[PDB]
Amino acid sequence: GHSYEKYNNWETIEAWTKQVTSENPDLISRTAIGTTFLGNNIYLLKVGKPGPNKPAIFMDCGFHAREWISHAFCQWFVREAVLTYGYESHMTEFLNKLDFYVLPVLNIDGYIYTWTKNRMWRKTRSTNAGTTCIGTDPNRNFDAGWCTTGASTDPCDETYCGSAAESEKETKALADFIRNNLSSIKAYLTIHSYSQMILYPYSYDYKLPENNAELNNLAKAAVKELATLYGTKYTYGPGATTIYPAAGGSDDWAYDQGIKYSFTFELRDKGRYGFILPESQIQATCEETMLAIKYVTNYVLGHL
Numbered sequence: 001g002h003s004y005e006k007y008n009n010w011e012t013i014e015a016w017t018k019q020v021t022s023e024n025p026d027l028i029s030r031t032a033i034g035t036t037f038l039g040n041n042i043y044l045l046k047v048g049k050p051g052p053n054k055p056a057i058f059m060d061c062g063f064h065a066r067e068w069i070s071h072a073f074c075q076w077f078v079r080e081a082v083l084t085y086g087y088e089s090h091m092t093e094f095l096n097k098l099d100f101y102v103l104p105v106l107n108i109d110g111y112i113y114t115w116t117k118n119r120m121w122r123k124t125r126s127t128n129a130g131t132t133c134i135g136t137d138p139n140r141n142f143d144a145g146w147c148t149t150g151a152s153t154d155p156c157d158e159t160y161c162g163s164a165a166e167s168e169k170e171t172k173a174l175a176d177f178i179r180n181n182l183s184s185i186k187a188y189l190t191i192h193s194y195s196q197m198i199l200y201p202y203s204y205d206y207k208l209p210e211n212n213a214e215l216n217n218l219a220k221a222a223v224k225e226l227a228t229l230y231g232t233k234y235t236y237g238p239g240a241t242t243i244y245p246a247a248g249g250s251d252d253w254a255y256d257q258g259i260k261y262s263f264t265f266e267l268r269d270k271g272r273y274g275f276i277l278p279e280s281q282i283q284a285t286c287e288e289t290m291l292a293i294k295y296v297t298n299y300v301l302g303h304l
């Protein structure tokens, strides 16, 4: 069965998306925004108190298959939202005023592969013409300085940028959805691990975002808020200089679409366990991350 303090396989996460929605129809609606290469359903949960023309924040998890704490966080977030609505003042206000679009797992095919065959798989599972090598790096696959830096043009490599921007059904589906809802989406949050960082644009180029000063101030405050809970220390800054250049990222693309608050989170840890973060750290990791996500949400709502 499903547990919020264990890593859950896709079959279980899928059943959870149906169950948590049916149990909370006044706060959650579920849709599918497309299919993966292997025909799995890309679910999206709209979390919020339904109402006319609300603003929104979009958050996805599970871009990269092996980053299991990412998938776990999106699930943790949804329960927090539904359990505390009506009781905790901030979350109640948040869900009254805006919607969270939560995409619990983007790269489902890769995630399944980490359960069935290879725990360290990263990419999608699409085939590539002319080779036996499988998969594209979804975070090199967006139309932002596409494949110009930090990306490989070889399908056998972990950072393969694809045959073209949005070549993958999964990234096409996410981009299609965001382009369809640009008028409402005010922030884009994409959850990864590990390294304990908050990153903002740019990553495909060393140029800085117009609101670089604001974004730095926001990230600084969010990492400060995160640390209050368990003392976990994050670093933060523009992607290119804070970790390394990587073109074709979804956060840079979202930002150049007009979404001025765009962030990549890298959750625990710092390398001791890396991608294989113990299930015993799920609760603490998710709890402290919630504080940063809520701080950002509170700020965004004050800047519509």
Ligand SMILES: CC(C)[C@H](NS(=O)(=O)CCCc1ccccc1)P(=O)(O)C[C@H](C(=O)O)c1cccc(CN)c1
Pocket: 064, 139, 140, 158, 159, 192, 193, 194, 195, 199, 203, 239, 240, 243, 244, 245, 246, 249, 250, 251, 252, 264, 266
């Ligand atoms: C541990 C964590 C930092 C992940 N890095 S990773 O798994 O070791 C990347 C593996 C491929 C690679 C190996 C060697 C050099 C460059 C790339 P990530 O979540 O996958 C980092 C992410 C990405 O590479 O897509 C990233 C990097 C730079 C900027 C951004 C923000 N768009 C996001």
Ligand SMILES: [Zn+2]
Pocket: 063, 064, 067, 192, 193
């Ligand atoms: Zn990642």
